[PDB]
Design brief:
It is classed as signaling protein. The entry lists the keywords signaling protein, Rossmann Fold, Response regulator, Magnesium binding, Signal transduction. By secondary structure, the protein is an alpha/beta fold. The protein has 5 helices and 5 strands, in the order βαβαβαβαβα. It has one domain: 3-Layer(aba) Sandwich (Rossmann fold). The longest helix has 13 residues. It is globular. Bound molecules: magnesium ion (MG). Magnesium ion binds next to loops.
Length: 124
């Protein structure tokens, strides 16, 4: 239930990456790294032996859902737990992400407490 887990944080707005990185810092996970887009995240996952991915859903290059799909179709990557960050869980979006295989979702603006709750849910 490891706090050394290697985490990738994906999102185009560096200030949001930095909030996420902190939040996870309050919770005991310090092993976090960043990518600014699914285009930049895929090569980091592919070569860097990650355990966990927190991805925004809206990115101009390759969208959250395209990253998730790329991860799930890669035998190497296929086991990764993925939390998606959304500005609003319209159900059509959550449904579609669940189909695509996400482990959970969390609505922004979120908190540490909600982050943990979400972390617990996914990992069972
Ligand atoms: Mg975004």
């Amino acid at each position: 239930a490891n706090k050394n887990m290697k985490i990738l944080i994906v999102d185009d707005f560096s200030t949001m990456r930095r909030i996420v990185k902190n939040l996870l810092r309050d919770l005991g996970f310090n092993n976090t790294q960043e990518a600014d887009d699914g285009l930049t995240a895929l090569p980091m996952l592919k070569k860097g032996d990650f355990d966990f991915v927190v991805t925004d859903w809206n990115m101009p290059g390759m969208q959250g859902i395209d990253l998730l799909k790329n991860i799930r179709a890669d035998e190497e990557l296929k086991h990764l737990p993925v939390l998606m960050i959304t500005a609003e869980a319209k159900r059509e979006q959550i449904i579609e992400a669940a189909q695509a295989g996400v482990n959970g979702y969390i609505v922004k603006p979120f908190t540490a407490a909600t982050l943990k709750e979400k972390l617990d849910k996914i990992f069972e």
